[PDB]
Amino acid sequence: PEHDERKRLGLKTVIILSSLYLLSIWVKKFKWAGIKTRKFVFNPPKPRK
Amino acid sequence: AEVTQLSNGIVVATEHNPSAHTASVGVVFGSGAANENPYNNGVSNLWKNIFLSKENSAVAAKEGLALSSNISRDFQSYIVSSLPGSTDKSLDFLNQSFIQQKANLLSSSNFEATKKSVLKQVQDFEDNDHPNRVLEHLHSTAFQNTPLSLPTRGTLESLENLVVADLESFANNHFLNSNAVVVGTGNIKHEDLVNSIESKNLSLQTGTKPVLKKKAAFLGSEVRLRDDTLPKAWISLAVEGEPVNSPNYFVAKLAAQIFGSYNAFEPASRLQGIKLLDNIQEYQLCDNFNHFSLSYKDSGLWGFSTATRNVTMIDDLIHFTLKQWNRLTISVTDTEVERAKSLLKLQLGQLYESGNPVNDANLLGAEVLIKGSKLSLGEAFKKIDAITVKDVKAWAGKRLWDQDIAIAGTGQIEGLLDYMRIRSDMSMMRW
């Protein structure tokens, strides 16, 4: 019996949830942006310790 | 009585002191270690160190002269100090060194004994002077790929790649008259120097301007020199500050003044009326800190600098501090501001009113270059005091709150956290 509502609500659930997914992704690369583009360099050091 | 300023081609500036036992003369070139380039770095500190090589400094040692030199970022100075009466003994020895002589100091036995000592010089600094080392790299990353970045004393790299043909390449471009100012400090008159200056003829490369580069800029960034073999941890942090001759030049120096400067050892320091201090002291989060608002012609650096033997708890150290900085925008006590205005003045004094002529030179030379004249203490104070709280709450509101920072450091900084933490503490959660 629930049928027509069930897809109705289903509609809403997905549209919102999809958007969150894509929105969440974006956000993630932002907060990671410093670590992703983070870049090291090596310079061996004079032997005395 | 109000500092003298007159130009006959050579802009001649002086500042009299009737209670000075000595005086000093010299030049200030309005182009410093930030008018250099990536691979000629340290050329300006190389020039300083031939100028004090035993050769030229033994000359002026029979004469009774002492020479002073320093390089900054926007500027560059060459000062000589002696008794006030031997005031021609200064001007002549200056004249010899900068228009007469050229290759007498530029020997292949001189220059390969100076460069083989400005190399040991910049190899004790980056080796054992971490607080400035950290402080220097802070510029390198905040002002990356831009004028201010180049360390004043120059990279050991671009400092073994430089011959005399390079000392000159910078000299003949940026050692001009239209980029210099002659200074008279201590115990001499304006009519003693500008007389003894128009006494001498000649003109070096007249009409010539020194050249320009892409104006400096700022970008939120880090650079970390971890070294777990060094007993402490040194960190310096900041935002895009305020330039010399910026509307908030003083507003910003007042802010620095509030949180100020700590030394966990001097019991005097432990009692300062600084709010932040309430936190830091509980567990002894650090050994010392200090703030600043470094101002340069094109851009500035408001932040602070700390050393600490406390490695597990650095993460709070940076936290308590950057949170305090938030108050400056949202909740600074007026009665804090007064203690600032008050203390700024005392500091700004011992800066400007020290009984040492050499300082009053660079101060004068740099300022009378950038804005033309100097600004009097009464002028400064008249500004400092005008400053309301709203002064400080709108300056932090643009400059401090939620803006990119610029961290750098070395020693045991594994505990020093990451960039999305630190940077995030620039704000506080609101409804």
Swiss-Prot record, chain A:
Residues 37-49 are mitochondrial matrix. It comes from the Eukaryota. It is found in: Mitochondrion inner membrane. The chain crosses the membrane at residues 3-36. Component of the ubiquinol-cytochrome c oxidoreductase (cytochrome b-c1 complex, complex III, CIII), a multisubunit enzyme composed of 10 subunits. The complex is composed of 3 respiratory subunits cytochrome b (COB), cytochrome c1 (CYT1) and Rieske protein (RIP1), 2 core protein subunits COR1 and QCR2, and 5 low-molecular weight protein subunits QCR6, QCR7, QCR8, QCR9 and QCR10. Belongs to the cytochrome c family. Present with 39900 molecules/cell in log phase SD medium. Component of the ubiquinol-cytochrome c oxidoreductase, a multisubunit transmembrane complex that is part of the mitochondrial electron transport chain which drives oxidative phosphorylation. This is Cytochrome c1, heme protein, mitochondrial. The lineage of its organism: Eukaryota, Fungi, Dikarya, Ascomycota, Saccharomycotina.
From Swiss-Prot, chain B:
SUPFAM superfamilies: LuxS/MPP-like metallohydrolase. Pfam families: Peptidase_M16, Peptidase_M16_C. One of its GO terms (molecular function) is metalloendopeptidase activity. GO terms for cellular component: mitochondrial inner membrane; mitochondrion; respiratory chain complex III. One of its GO terms (biological process) is proton transmembrane transport. It is a peripheral membrane protein. Its main location: mitochondrion. It is found in: Mitochondrion inner membrane. The keyword Endoplasmic reticulum does not apply. InterPro entries: Metalloenz_LuxS/M16, MPP/UQCRC_Complex, Pept_M16_N, Peptidase_M16_C. Keywords: Electron transport, Membrane, Mitochondrion, Mitochondrion inner membrane, Respiratory chain, Transit peptide, Transport. The keyword Secreted does not apply. Component of the ubiquinol-cytochrome c oxidoreductase (cytochrome b-c1 complex, complex III, CIII), a multisubunit enzyme composed of 10 subunits. The complex is composed of 3 respiratory subunits cytochrome b (COB), cytochrome c1 (CYT1) and Rieske protein (RIP1), 2 core protein subunits COR1 and QCR2, and 5 low-molecular weight protein subunits QCR6, QCR7, QCR8, QCR9 and QCR10. Belongs to the peptidase M16 family. UQCRC1/QCR1 subfamily. Component of the ubiquinol-cytochrome c oxidoreductase, a multisubunit transmembrane complex that is part of the mitochondrial electron transport chain which drives oxidative phosphorylation. PANTHER family: CYTOCHROME B-C1 COMPLEX SUBUNIT 1, MITOCHONDRIAL, METALLOPROTEASE. This is Cytochrome b-c1 complex subunit 1, mitochondrial. It comes from Saccharomyces cerevisiae (strain ATCC 204508 / S288c).
